[PDB]
């Protein structure tokens, strides 16, 4: 069901520091090479009064390059797909909670994400739009009662050479109601999320990710 070329579409909605918004995206990638690109529009609430970087990691686990010898939980979850649930905590006080659903409809991956961010300091880099993308990172993946827990410590780059550290656990759960899933062992996933394009007030963003599974 997961072909060498797959398309995806996404709706992402919620609020950060009380500011309500909605974004829509579409893209494509090669799930077996771990590559994808997505074009994203802010369709409600724009221009956002915060860095889009905080939303960027919420827009795609089907596109990880897994070796033969590490079972691929996400690809095996289809046709039904999977969900993920995350709480991201930032060094300077912001917390963002995300719930995501991943499905497959008529050959296309479809994503719905609900986001709620609070307590980002008003004078901090997020709310002042002084960030400059994510450092590449490695997500540890742990098997947990028929799902996976991912654990990431990520650094958001900020103007003037700083970074904001953030951490999170992600809970990945299968939606499969018929069929089997071969569970992997502990492993890691290397991520590079790159901003390719943006409009002036980040109302339009193109980003790409490269994700590769490796032994831990």
Reading phi first (left if > 0) and then psi (alpha if -120 to 50, else beta), residue 6 is in beta
d(CA 7, CA 108): 5
Determine contact, residues 60/38, Cβ cutoff 8 Å.
Answer: yes
Domains (ranges, CATH) in the chain? 1-216 (2.40.155.10)
Q: Which residues pair with 85 in a beta bridge?
A: 99, 171
Determine contact, residues 182/71, Cβ cutoff 8 Å.
Answer: yes
Residues making up the chain, counted from first to last? 216
C-alpha of 117 from chain center: 15
d(CA 74, CA 67): 13
| Method of structure determination | X-ray
Count CB neighbours of 69 within 10 A.
10
d(CA 21, CA 16): 8
Resolution of the coordinates in A?
1.6
């Amino acid at each position: 069901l997961i072909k060498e070329n797959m398309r995806m579409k996404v709706v992402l909605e919620g609020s950060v520091n009380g500011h309500q918004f909605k974004c829509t995206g579409e893209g494509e990638g090669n799930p077996y090479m771990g590559t994808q690109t997505m074009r994203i529009k802010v369709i409600e609430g724009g221009p956002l009064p915060f860095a889009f970087d905080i939303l960027a990691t919420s827009f795609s686990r089907t596109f990880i390059k897994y070796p033969k010898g590490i079972p691929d939980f996400f690809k095996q979850s289809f046709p039904e797909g999977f969900t993920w649930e995350r709480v991201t905590r930032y060094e300077d006080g912001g917390v963002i909670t995300v719930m995501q659903d991943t499905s497959l409809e008529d050959g296309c991956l479809v994503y719905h994400a609900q986001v709620r961010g609070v307590n980002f300091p008003s004078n901090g880099a997020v709310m002042q739009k002084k960030t400059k993308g994510w450092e590449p990172n490695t997500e540890m993946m742990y098997p947990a009662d028929g799902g996976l827990r991912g654990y990431t410590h990520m650094a958001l780059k900020v103007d003037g050479g700083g970074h904001l550290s953030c951490s999170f656990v992600t809970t990945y759960r299968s939606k499969k109601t018929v069929g089997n899933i071969k569970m992997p062992g502990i492993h890691a996933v290397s991520h590079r999320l790159e901003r390719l394009e943006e409009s002036d007030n980040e109302m339009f963003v193109v980003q790409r990710e490269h994700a590769v599974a490796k032994f831990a």
